[PDB]
Amino acid sequence: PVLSKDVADIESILALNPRTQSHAALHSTLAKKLDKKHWKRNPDKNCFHCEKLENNFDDIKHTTLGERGALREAMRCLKCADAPCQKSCPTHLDIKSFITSISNKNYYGAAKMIFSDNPLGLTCGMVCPTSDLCVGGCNLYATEEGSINIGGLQQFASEVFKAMNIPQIRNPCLPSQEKMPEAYSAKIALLGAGPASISCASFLARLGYSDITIFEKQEYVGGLSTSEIPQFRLPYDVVNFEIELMKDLGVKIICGKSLSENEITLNTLKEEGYKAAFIGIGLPEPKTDDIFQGLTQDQGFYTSKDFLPLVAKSSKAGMCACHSPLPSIRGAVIVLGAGDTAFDCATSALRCGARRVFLVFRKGFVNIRAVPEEVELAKEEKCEFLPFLSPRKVIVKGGRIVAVQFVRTEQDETGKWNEDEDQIVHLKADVVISAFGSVLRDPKVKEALSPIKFNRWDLPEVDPETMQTSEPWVFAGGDIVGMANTTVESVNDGKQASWYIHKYIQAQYGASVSAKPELPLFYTPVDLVDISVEMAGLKFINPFGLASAAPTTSSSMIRRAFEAGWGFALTKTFSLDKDIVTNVSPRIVRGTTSGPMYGPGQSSFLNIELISEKTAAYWCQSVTELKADFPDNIVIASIMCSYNKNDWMELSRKAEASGADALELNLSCACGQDPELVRNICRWVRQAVQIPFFAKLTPNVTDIVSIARAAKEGGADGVTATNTVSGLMGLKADGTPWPAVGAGKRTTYGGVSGTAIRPIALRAVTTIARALPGFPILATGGIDSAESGLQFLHSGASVLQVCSAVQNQDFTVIQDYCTGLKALLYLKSIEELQGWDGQSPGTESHQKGKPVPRIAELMGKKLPNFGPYLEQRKKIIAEEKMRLKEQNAAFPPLERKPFIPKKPIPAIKDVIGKALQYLGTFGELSNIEQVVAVIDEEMCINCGKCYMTCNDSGYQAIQFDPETHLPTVTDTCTGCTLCLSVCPIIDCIRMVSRTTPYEPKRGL
Amino acid sequence: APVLSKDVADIESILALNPRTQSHAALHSTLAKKLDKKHWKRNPDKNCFHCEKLENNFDDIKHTTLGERGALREAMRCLKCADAPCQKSCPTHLDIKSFITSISNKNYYGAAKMIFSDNPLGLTCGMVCPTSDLCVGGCNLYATEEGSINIGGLQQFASEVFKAMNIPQIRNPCLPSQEKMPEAYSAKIALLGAGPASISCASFLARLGYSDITIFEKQEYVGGLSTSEIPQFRLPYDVVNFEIELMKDLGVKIICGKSLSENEITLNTLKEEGYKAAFIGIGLPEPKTDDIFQGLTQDQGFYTSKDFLPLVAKSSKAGMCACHSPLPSIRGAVIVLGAGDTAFDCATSALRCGARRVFLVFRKGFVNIRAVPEEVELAKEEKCEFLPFLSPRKVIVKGGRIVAVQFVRTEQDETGKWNEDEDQIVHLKADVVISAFGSVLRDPKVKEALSPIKFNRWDLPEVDPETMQTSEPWVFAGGDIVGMANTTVESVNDGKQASWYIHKYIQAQYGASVSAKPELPLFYTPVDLVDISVEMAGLKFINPFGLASAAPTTSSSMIRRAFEAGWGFALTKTFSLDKDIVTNVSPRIVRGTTSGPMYGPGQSSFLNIELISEKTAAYWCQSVTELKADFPDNIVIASIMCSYNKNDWMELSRKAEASGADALELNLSCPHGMGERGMGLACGQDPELVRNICRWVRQAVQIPFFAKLTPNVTDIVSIARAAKEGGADGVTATNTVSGLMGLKADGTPWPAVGAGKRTTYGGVSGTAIRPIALRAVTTIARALPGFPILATGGIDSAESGLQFLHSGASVLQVCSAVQNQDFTVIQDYCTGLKALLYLKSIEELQGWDGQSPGTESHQKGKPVPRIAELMGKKLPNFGPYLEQRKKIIAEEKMRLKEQNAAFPPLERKPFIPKKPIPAIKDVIGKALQYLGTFGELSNIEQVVAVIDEEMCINCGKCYMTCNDSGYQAIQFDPETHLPTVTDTCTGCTLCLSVCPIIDCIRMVSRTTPYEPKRGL
Ligand SMILES: *C(#[C])C1=[C][N]C(=O)[N]C1=O
């Protein structure tokens, strides 16, 4: 046979494989019009009817992210200085920091940052109108690809933390309870269990107050988050999770208790011994209109305060223990108003079975004040919009609404709004829902607030800085004060008030508080995890340190690094006076190792920098200063001399005398290629000083073990592995290099740093640790996260040096690294999370980060998410929602119980070197335990990359269906694993144990 | 000495905005936050009812426009899908996967060539295609949160770069010379109307070789609706001219002033004058009217879209007319009737004419608007009002002017019938009324001129939808006139479809057949004639790109298909004698972690623990004979490995030579000895062993052979020199870098083999090792000049290939870039290399970096207005500063109005090479002169960073990098977030390296005195 030619059935498998084209393609316009429908992904501009949504409370948010999408979007964020997104967030979330933690896979640290400034952090990620807040300030709006999805990233990190099932703990900076001053036992009352009071009580509990009670009128908690925000935007379980975190702090909630003249009043609270009160009851009554007087729900009329709680009680399991039906809303529905409630009524009316929904408002389109993302949900669900119409009468016949009568409105040219009585509309309708807003009108509630002053708008007046009412022991915030338009602002109101309630209460007990407000952060048991490590007789408070490099150019820089939390730092390499150098410029350039991607996350740098231009005298005096001020932070002096015994002894003694904890010998800036020279330099230093010292090894050697062993034989206490890899980062198209120095545009070979060299450094660390067991290793080379640091610890290193990740960012990454490592170690003790990979939950089947419904009629039926297959999927899902309208839904636990460690939290010493047991020769690998690839069709996005890679880099083993674009791995798979390695969807392809007989393909 | 390790007051102040770790939650009142939010605002303000001023502002408003930075990022995001659904969804069937692959590889010429091969109006279509209803509507990435690819903006970008290159289209180089074309190709061909349909039809007919093609156009201008109605702020007129001039390069003639009409041109007159075929592409030339508008005039304020949009076009498109046309004075309230796509262009154009308010009023609902959402969004963001369910009944005229329109309300039934409620009326005040009810063909003289073709019930010419032939076999039609096409691209496609069957018909009239498979030619320029062959070690390569010995050459059948795709050469997978048979483990090839958790296209590395080929020496040797018999001009190199044994190397190398291999490659990865006498375990790490192996092979065979070096050596030059001393004809530099790609959080490796989850060190490949391979190639090339080098290591484009050629390599092996994609990248590499060599001869493009134009000051890839009162005024693009920028721009648009001069759109003349096009051999090693020792670098000629404030996006990354990795030399303003480099800059270049905007920071020669910081 012709061995170099595909047989017919392989040619058939390859039918859809890309080929070079020699001619232009003929396809008629008519044929193209038909074929278009088969592949269609997005909405069809010619489809005019709603997709059937009855009883469908699936998540419809466009911002929801799965892990794959969250990691991509978090790496895209520029992580800006003085970031304007944060300036535009009402609770001042450090967005730069929490997104940095997501990009480093440290979802705990991200969640901790979010909840530190916003105790309703998951609710807000889900519901914030970010285009009018943080996202509206995002610098990336000035790029074509646009602003960052801050809300979805916040939601993703908080959802992971929620799944971790870790409790909030008492502020660990507080004295123990029995030693708290008496003032912290003051009785505190909050009225209403909505976002404002939940925030306020949370922050007061952080400060140490131990007798905090929220009094809630209803039998459910959460306020509007629970009673009106739809389940398909905010799942009820999110609310319960945030309330559970608050109860972890000891806040008490009593339901069925109202602020009202005949129940709880300011006077009764005072007479019962309460020292302070926060009013957070919101706006409990609908704004009503005379033209709807006397109309009942049976006739077809609702206010939004009637309608949305009925829908929420029916669709939110565990909200109201009873199980309620969805309101029967069939026919034509008119929603009146154009605020944000109106759009929730319209989308909710479709879930109750409406046939058609009209939003009717009395001004124009340009005057809609709902945020665009709110408007777009109603738009994409085919709601009709009628502007410039003011309601006049509701027509009732046979006891039911049949029509609403409107008059036309218009702006004259003083901007006044007029009604035109001769211009009427008779609009047919079966249901009418007014969404005119909300008010506080109940006289008995307002009287219970005597004697605080009310303003023009019938609302309690507060000082906007302190949230204090006219009575100094009473504070208010949230919707009842009338400034907040959002959950996040109501949260911020309670946060703001908590500091000044604290101030007031302390003063009442004769105590002062700081002139600078200081609210505590959010804490969990993770934060108590010990990440110290001992190596070479030195105690490191944490294992992260600054490498000898550009971030240690000056000792003032090291000072700020220690103030930020870094466990240790190297000096830039310095030398004796006679070895003074002068750097050239340019000398540090970005890596080309991952394509033309600019900004954050450069995968490498190249430098042609020399030793420090600052003198030994500068560096020795600086080390003395640093060790005087930061005795617990390890300072290592990096030094270099030429091959000369007297010089190495002189310089090492000078650095030792300054107080350096240890020295690092730069042999890798060559002496460091030759084991005999390395051994001799180490011997000279070992005879000169008594402090530990480490030889910094170059990776540019045939066998790095031979030079590590030489350093050890010379008396080094350990080795730093490794310095930069020698390289050339490339050329312009005209041939000139970058960096190009001087008029001659000259360069020399440079050192490559960053994540591109991590595989080389990991190899070096493991091979040294296997050759020299127990010999201290300081790792450097691409460490940019707690998880990558843990890879080096697992590989045998004891501490972790960082350069490029700081060049890509700033010193504050240390806080991400420390919280992330604490979380990785903590999670190893949780038996329930043992199937996670570090902080990543096991991937579930998802499309666009939303779980695929587990419906029998959808599985295995080869229905991809496009064209007529998508139409079939939507019909199947809709029928299953109707089927579910007849059945019980369980309750969640009245409230979940946290996971508890079932074994000790590992210390760093317990994880060092644990990867080495899996490392060996090729002959120690099984060739009989073979694997094959298997594709989860429900996660596939139909790109064919697995197919293209098996075709042109593999075994032609994948069928790619010409109609569904679904791949199937066949039995000729060899398990090479290339398809998994190119698939864009994390864990869509998995390698599984081969079950059928295996025969290597010998071609012969 | 003071405290050296503390910042002085001046530096503490510079560091004021530097990020710091917080120990406490931050207190900020809700009221203060409300008052601060406005300062930073970037996007539209939902509370703003107030459309900013747009009079005489014809600047690009498209959301899809891309600059180079944005285009590269978006092209790398594309999955480059097999059997791609976006292409299925494009009416001209563009190979979107290929052209976007080219853009990601910086080959903008190859992208534009692929675009224009299937669409001669590719730049126009990139700008105006309603992609959400076409290609983008099918994009697989719609199934991700980040969403579908901006295909149109990518197409627009590549085409814009190609337009800037100023390269002409050439006659199809596959044709015989003109004088030996058959007589049939001189048949006289007429096209009626110079719109997209005819321009496309004439282009493809000219590609086929027809030499007498004339388009007869009614008007004095050309381009059809693209010229006369699509607004300048969506489609610049110079785009239309550029595409017209490309077609004219093929010899097509256009005659303006001559109409298809009774008493002018008719099908009868064309026939009598000896035309053999005619294409009707006159569109729909007349407005759809409404009785209620009878007798109303422009002076009263009434326009159809066919009156209004050409008036705006004539005034705003320089080079449309000779008349400097005044913009229509459209002051007051404008009512635009209808809600198709024309109505929205009327609305936005009315604002450019000075309208105070625009109402878009339509007789159905919102759900019934047919316009694409892209088009609707532009009218909404410009604050047009939308009034649904209104049907016009009366235009009110007082004092010679429209003052109002009265409407009736509309309504749907049970039956879905639309009704009008006479008792429900709207009286809407207005100064101008523009009807956008569509277009028609209704002129009796024009239809008469088409006698006797058959017309359908819609008074349009009938065609066969597959052939575009009318009922008269010599007459074809397409575009708007046929009534199927709703877009420029479908009209282009109608002319494309018609050209093949016009060709078929004409050829048959002259007694000739055509192929049963339609074969329209591709698009060509002089770039495609560029020679990219190279000679090396006596071997002739037809291009310098070849498949490395790796997974893409697992089987000889794959090499066969790679040769069919265009690869110049290929290596076999390394093979060995029978006694050295191996068994691979699985898993064994994994993605790199070298650029973080980015999945899918463009993996920056792979790691593999793969062995030699599992297939026999007999398989490989027979395969090499077959491949060399079928592809004599494609070079096949047999890769072989033996243990350190003279008889084995001689036996295997002779076997491979006898099979007809052009050359051998010695894989020096076999272990020998123990392996750390300083020279490690593999034979390729010890110079003595390499020299001996090479001696053995040199004795055994007479064909050239090359030693494949490992980068895992202290001194690779010593191995290369040993191979040369042993008699090798060159070296392959380099194999993979030894590494461990990473560990799971539980400590297990990946790849993990077996239930034990074991691994061993693997080889790292891909762009992550390119700096290592480039250094290895360069050092060998400088130490052993003229010794042939085959480069390997992260080559994934023509641009990166040329870097290796400049560094001393002669040919270019590829593995990982094919693993990331498929064999067809070779097409991108070949056109890309042709284009790079072509451009070196073009003096006018010296300022470009390869195919990249010099970066102009931009925001979102749109150029910033060069306005004095706008430059250096510390006005970033947010908050109150943006609103001052908008005021300054609007005032300057007005000053450009009240003086209505300047109509000089340059006449387009292509650049000519001023020197010979370099061959491959002319560029090899030309970068090596810039290399040297560190002491050869000037420390006297220092640089500093300088920032272009107009390009900055205010992120402060330069500031943060200088603060915590540099010299604290940048001031970052607390209110504008604008950075300024101060005189303490050392030129280290880290800020430039982290800035997200290409060329926002530049390094310039230092002019002030320089002193190194010594700290003392
Ligand atoms: C010296 C000093 C060095 C310069 N650049 C590096 O990457 N490493 C060094 O050791």
Ligand SMILES: C#Cc1c[nH]c(=O)[nH]c1=O
């Ligand atoms: C045999 C063999 C090889 C396998 N993998 C590599 O990366 N390089 C080789 O040489």
Ligand code: SF4
């Ligand atoms: S890094 Fe670039 S874009 Fe960001 S502030 Fe600096 S100059 Fe501007």
